[PDB]
Amino acid sequence: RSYSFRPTYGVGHQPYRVVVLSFELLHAPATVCGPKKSTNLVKNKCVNF
């Protein structure tokens, strides 16, 4: 059967696009991770690198 997406209907029947996010933790290839905290550069003094 088919959805009805006519503009005459209010909240509850109008289309709400949804995307499902689910991860896997059975195999361990150590891939897919996000970057963070890429700061500036410091020279000619003490450095906590």
Epitope: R1, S2, S4, Y9, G10, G12, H13
Partner: antibody
Framework: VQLVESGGGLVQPGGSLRLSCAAS????????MSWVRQGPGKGLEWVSV???????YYADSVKARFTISRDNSKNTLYLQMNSLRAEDTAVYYC?????????????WGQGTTVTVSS | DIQMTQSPSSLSASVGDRVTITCQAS??????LNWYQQKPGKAPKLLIY???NLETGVPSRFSGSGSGTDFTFTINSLQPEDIATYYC?????????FGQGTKVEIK
Amino acid sequence: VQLVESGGGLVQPGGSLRLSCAASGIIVSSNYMSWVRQGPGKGLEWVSVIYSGGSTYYADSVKARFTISRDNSKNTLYLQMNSLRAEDTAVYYCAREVVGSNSNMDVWGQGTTVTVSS
Amino acid sequence: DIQMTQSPSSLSASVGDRVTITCQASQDINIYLNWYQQKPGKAPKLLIYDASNLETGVPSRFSGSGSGTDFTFTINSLQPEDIATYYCQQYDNLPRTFGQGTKVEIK
């Protein structure tokens, strides 16, 4: 395609049995069924719905009472209650889905208007 | 719980007259709002599907329009064989509930 009724008589409060309604060849396991109350002094009242996936949805005021059973070959749906509080002066009509999108398969059935009293 | 209320309940004096009966609801609902035509002593019956269709065998004078939680129906023909009662129900929403009841009768 018609419906077969099993019921009648008078029962006391606190007693429950298997209310039974059958089809005339319609699929009973792989179909949608609904139960409603027809009672004197009031309109029709929604009771329960059972889907082909084995999921039952019914009212929260009658929770922990309804136990439904769909027989595979006898084609006769059973329903069992528990702890009747004497408000069942009515009849349980069994029915199908009225319309999914566009369908005229709308055969219904009748029953005996049973009462529960001292 | 969904509560449906209707003003045209008992049209006992509406004999041979234009009928403008209707059903509403508290929460706004779509076209999925059907009706029950219950004869005395027999199960409720469907004439209109999705508040906009017609049963296969019925007189063609029946026409019901439902949009924006307002289902309006008319019966211009006052046939004696349809002494019954009319009910309003909404579906495709949890939970399915029935109306309080309306009376139709020809003197």
